Amino acid sequence: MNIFEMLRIDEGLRLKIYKDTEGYYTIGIGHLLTKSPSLNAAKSELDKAIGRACAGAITKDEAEKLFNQDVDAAVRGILRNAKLKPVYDSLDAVRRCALINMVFQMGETGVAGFTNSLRMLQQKRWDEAAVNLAKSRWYNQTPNRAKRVITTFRTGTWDAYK
Numbered sequence: 001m002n003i004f005e006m007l008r009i010d011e012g013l014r015l016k017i018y019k020d021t022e023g024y025y026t027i028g029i030g031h032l033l034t035k036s037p038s039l040n041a042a043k044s045e046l047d048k049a050i051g052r053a054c055a056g057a058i059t060k061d062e063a064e065k066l067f068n069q070d071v072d073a074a075v076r077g078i079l080r081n082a083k084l085k086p087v088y089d090s091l092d093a094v095r096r097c098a099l100i101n102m103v104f105q106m107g108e109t110g111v112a113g114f115t116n117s118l119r120m121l122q123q124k125r126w127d128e129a130a131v132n133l134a135k136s137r138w139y140n141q142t143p144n145r146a147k148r149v150i151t152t153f154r155t156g157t158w159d160a161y162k
């Protein structure tokens with residue numbers, strides 16, 4: 001199991017513009033296009049990202065191209081963030097994937113606000129971090145996914161994904 005397979009499971013694949021769980025325009029493998037309620041706005045954004053006249057649909061390849069870009073952006077974002085880097089550095093490989101999952105989904109900024117949770121992860125207090133992570137809107141809005149990520153952190157294994 002690797003991060004790509006992991007995210008591919010959590011986000012799914014869609015080749016046509018869709019709304020996410022929060023009503024935003026997304027496409028491919030969780031690639032957010034825009035928050036904005038405007039479909040053209042979305043449409044525009046897509047053509048601009050792909051670089052062609054998409055007509056709100058893209059190929060598999062395009063979807064994976066964007067996915068590689070987003071996962072790389074996530075890693076670099078973490079590696080560059082004064083709050084996230086130390087946590088990431090402190091973790092084992094499996095658990096690092098879980099931190100990348102969160103960033104992909106909520107952004108570095110979203111993640112950087114889980115202050116307490118971050119601190120507990122850093123002290124390797126798995127059970128406690130798991131509890132704290134669960135007291136969040138994130139968990140309440142996407143519980144099943146939040147749970148998979150949380151178990152990943154609690155255990156250090158890919159069981160939640162097998």
Ligand SMILES: [Cl-]
Nearest residue numbers: 134135136137
């Ligand atoms: Cl809560």
Ligand SMILES: [Cl-]
Nearest residue numbers: 142143144145
């Ligand atoms: Cl969910």
